[PDB]
Design a protein around this ligand. Structure first.
Ligand SMILES: OC[C@H]1O[C@H](O[C@H]2[C@H](O)[C@@H](O)[C@@H](O[C@H]3[C@H](O)[C@@H](O)[C@@H](O[C@H]4[C@H](O)[C@@H](O)[C@@H](O[C@H]5[C@H](O)[C@@H](O)[C@@H](O)O[C@@H]5CO)O[C@@H]4CO)O[C@@H]3CO)O[C@@H]2CO)[C@H](O)[C@@H](O)[C@@H]1O
Length: 476
């Protein structure tokens, strides 16, 4: 009697490329590409398990731009330059980027503490600041190859910095290939999301927010976003088809966000399976076990992720030592395995690139120990999404209706309902009336609304510049 375990790592970045200048205004796609987007599937080279991935189309666009050498990344340019050529504005951004990241485990170099305590940096100190910011984001593959440069920890030269940069771009250039390979080998399924990661239930019917938060104030949606919701899904099918050669039959709904209308749209667009969050399940049915495969109105298959297991990796186990964390995770799977006399399906679904920076050594000890243990446990079978979709020896149930929500408390409050987030929607609504191109779809991404009306400086001014630039460009 097996326990079926399904990892589904979601990868996404909003579009950081300013439409007028073409400049990538933040380096987050570059840094997660070199740290996570290649290395997370590359674990499948060394471990005989199945792992699944979601790639948003807007992320794929950016990965391709960096791989082709076309991305003009302003923070990266400040890294690459000889410090004698740095603008004062570039030295300032270098220091602010360091201070934002200072306390993360992947930044635990004694030298960074030294450099942040100095009143002013000479050329050698700036070279160490640039190169340590680079090396802090080193992924698993190159942490082996560049181990000696990493251990050095100080006194970096321009040549060593450029060497690291060349190896990083080699990693980016191989990134789409590794997703194609693990897919062709049956080592994992690859899904996508509606193109720019929007809140599909809101675009289809903004009133769905009242199913969970009736007291929320939302602006006057004086224009229809229903066609745009279709276009996000349709364009995403086309981008996936270009990259992987087939139309996707699995999709990750952004923010796990579903509604009756959204599920109908995915079904209409040929999606056969998605996943969403256990809170939505609890809100929608009485007996809310997440270990069943659900069928929404016999139209589309829906799995509900195990929220506690997903949150343990996503948020808890950074605060644990790696071995203890793996023992805790396996022990919880044991309890699930023992708690039912059927074969449970256990979906572990979370962002695949954001939690590791808070783990010791970028989560590599944790994931290596976790996957090594999993590959040898005889009562656990890890599945591709395709295997989980067609598994016959599991329990099954039909659901007729869901309560609209997201994996954030089962509601939409992180993207709508306060004055500053509502202002973004009002701006989008007014721009949509006059929109003339697909940059309006870019501005519909959830990321812009997530950061608006929050304390989270800095670079929130940069997300604001991006959103409003996309809104302006959509009208021309
Ligand atoms: O204030 C409390 C809060 O603030 C601080 O967070 C800061 C981060 O620690 C800091 O690094 C920076 O956050 C960056 C982030 O590091 C960077 O990668 C980028 O974030 C990307 C994600 O990487 C990307 O995956 C995507 O995330 C989506 C996600 O895919 C989706 O499934 C869902 O979960 O929504 C996410 C957001 O839309 O996109 C984002 C960009 O939108 O940019 C971030 C912002 O610069 O800055 C944060 C402070 O401003 C604390 O340190 C943090 O721990 C606290 O919780």
């Amino acid at each position: 009697k097996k326990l079926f375990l399904v990892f589904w790592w979601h990868m996404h970045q909003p579009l950081y490329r300013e439409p007028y200048t073409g400049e990538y205004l933040l380096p987050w796609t570059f840094f997660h590409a070199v740290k996570d987007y290649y290395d997370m599937p590359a674990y499948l080279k060394d471990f005989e398990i199945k792992l699944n991935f979601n790639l948003t189309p807007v992320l794929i666009d950016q990965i391709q731009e960096y791989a082709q050498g076309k991305a003009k990344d302003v923070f990266l340019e400040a890294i690459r330059k000889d410090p004698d050529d740095l603008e004062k504005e570039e030295v300032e951004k270098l220091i602010e980027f360091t201070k934002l990241n200072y306390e993360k485990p992947i930044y635990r170099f004694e030298r960074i503490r030294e450099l942040m305590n100095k009143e002013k940096l000479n050329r050698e100190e700036l070279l160490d600041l640039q190169t340590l910011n680079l090396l802090a984001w080193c992924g698993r593959t190159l942490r082996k190859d560049l181990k000696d440069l990493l251990n050095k920890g100080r006194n970096y030269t321009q040549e060593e910095k450029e060497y690291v940069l060349n190896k990083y771009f080699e990693i980016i250039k191989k990134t789409l290939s590794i997703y194609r390979e693990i897919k062709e080998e049956g080592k994992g399924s690859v899904s996508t999301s509606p193109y720019y990661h929007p809140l599909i239930p809101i675009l289809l019917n903004p009133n769905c927010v009242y199913e969970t938060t009736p007291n929320v104030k939302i602006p006057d949606f004086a224009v229809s976003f229903r066609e745009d919701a279709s276009k996000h899904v349709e364009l995403a099918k086309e981008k996936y088809f270009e990259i992987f050669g087939e139309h996707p039959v699995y999709m990750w709904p952004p923010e796990a966000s579903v509604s009756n209308e959204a599920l109908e749209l995915y079904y209409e667009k040929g999606i056969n399976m998605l996943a969403t969050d256990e809170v939505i399940l609890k809100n929608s049915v009485e007996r809310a076990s997440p270990y069943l495969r659900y069928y929404f109105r016999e139209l589309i298959s829906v799995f509900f992720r195990d929220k506690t297991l997903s949150d343990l990796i996503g948020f808890s186990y950074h605060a644990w030592n790696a071995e203890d964390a793996v023992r805790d995770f396996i022990g919880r799977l044991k309890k699930i395995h023992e708690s039912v006399d059927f074969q449970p399906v256990v979906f572990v679904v979370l962002n695949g690139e954001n939690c590791w920076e808070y783990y010791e050594e970028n989560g590599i000890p944790f994931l290596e120990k976790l996957y090594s243990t999993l590959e040898k446990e005889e009562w656990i079978e890890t599945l591709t999404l395709e295997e989980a979709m067609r598994k016959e020896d599991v329990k099954t149930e039909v659901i007729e209706s869901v309560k609209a929500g997201t994996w954030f408390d089962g509601n939409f409050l992180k993207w709508i309902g306060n004055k500053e987030k509502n202002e973004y929607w009002k701006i989008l609504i007014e721009a949509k009336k006059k929109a003339k191109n697909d940059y309006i779809l870019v501005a519909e991404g959830s990321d812009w609304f997530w950061w608006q009306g929050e304390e989270k400086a800095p670079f929130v001014e940069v997300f604001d510049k991006l959103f409003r630039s996309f809104v302006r460009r959509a009208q021309e």
